[PDB]
């Protein structure tokens, strides 16, 4: 939405009230810990492929 601030040489706006807002901020910290067995993944139960 377009706004136009009424700037002037002698004009100030001072709030006469307030409000208390509570917002939510969400942050990832960690992810899934995986582990890979190389021999069991590549060949798998095969001695000559190992």
């Amino acid at each position: 939405a377009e706004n136009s601030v009424a700037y002037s040489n002698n004009s100030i706006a001072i709030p006469t009230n307030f409000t208390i807002s509570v917002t939510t901020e969400i942050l990832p910290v960690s992810m899934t810990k995986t582990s890979v067995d190389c021999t069991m993944y590549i060949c798998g139960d095969s001695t000559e492929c190992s």
Binding site: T32, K33, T34, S35, V36, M40, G44
Partner: protein, 50 residues
């Protein structure tokens, strides 16, 4: 999930369980409520919330 376990792809559990993370957040909440910022700089100093 069992197909990944059969293929050498395992998932390790985290070291800190969710009960322990909840105990950390409980300690931080109790310190923030009952001491303000004073427990971050050293020993906690009690102060009324007002």
């Amino acid at each position: 999930i069992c197909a990944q376990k059969f293929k050498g792809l395992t998932v390790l559990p985290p070291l800190l369980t969710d009960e322990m993370i909840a105990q950390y957040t409980s300690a931080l909440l109790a310190g923030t409520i009952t001491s303000g910022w004073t427990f971050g700089a050293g020993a906690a100093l009690q102060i009324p919330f007002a």
